[PDB]
Amino acid sequence: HMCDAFVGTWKLVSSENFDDYMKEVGVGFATRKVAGMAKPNMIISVNGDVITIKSESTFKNTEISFILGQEFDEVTADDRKVKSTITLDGGVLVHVQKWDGKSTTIKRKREDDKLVVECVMKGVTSTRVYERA
Numbered sequence: 284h285m286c287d288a289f290v291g292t293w294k295l296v297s298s299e300n301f302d303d304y305m306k307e308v309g310v311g312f313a314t315r316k317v318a319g320m321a322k323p324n325m326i327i328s329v330n331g332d333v334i335t336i337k338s339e340s341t342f343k344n345t346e347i348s349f350i351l352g353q354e355f356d357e358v359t360a361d362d363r364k365v366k367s368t369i370t371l372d373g374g375v376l377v378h379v380q381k382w383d384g385k386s387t388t389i390k391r392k393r394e395d396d397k398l399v400v401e402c403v404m405k406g407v408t409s410t411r412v413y414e415r416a
């Protein structure tokens with residue numbers, strides 16, 4: 284019953300500062316423009332110890348499956364090849380991505396009926412709010 288309140292199908296309803304987050308990460312112009320238009324659905328499921336997070340949009344479809352605390356390799360929507368580790372910290376899914384000596388952290392939390400996603404790279408934060416689909 285690990286992660287029960289995250290499981291389901293979620294739709295993006297608002298984004299703030301995502302262009303600047305993508306800039307900070309190193310995403311190029313054309314990818315930022317197309318990625319920034321997307322209104323993904325995020326589909327979270329759990330089977331035993333394995334959590335799966337899918338993101339589907341007109342821009343890209345991504346899927347990760349993982350065990351908490353156990354590093355895995357991820358190809359991000361912008362084609363970075365990163366090493367990822369996801370843990371639960373006080374009810375928040377904390378996702379760290381490492382690549383080329385760089386690091387970004389993505390937090391996912393349940394707040395009221397929303398799933399709030401906070402993406403941080405150095406001093407730049409973006410907040411993306413999802414609602415149940």
Ligand SMILES: O=C(O)[C@H]1C[C@@H]2ON=C(c3ccc(Cl)cc3)[C@@H]2C1
Nearest residue numbers: 310314318338359360361389400411
């Ligand atoms: O809303 C979300 O799912 C957040 C968390 C995800 O993890 N990485 C994202 C990302 C990075 C670069 C690009 Cl170009 C697009 C998307 C997603 C944005």
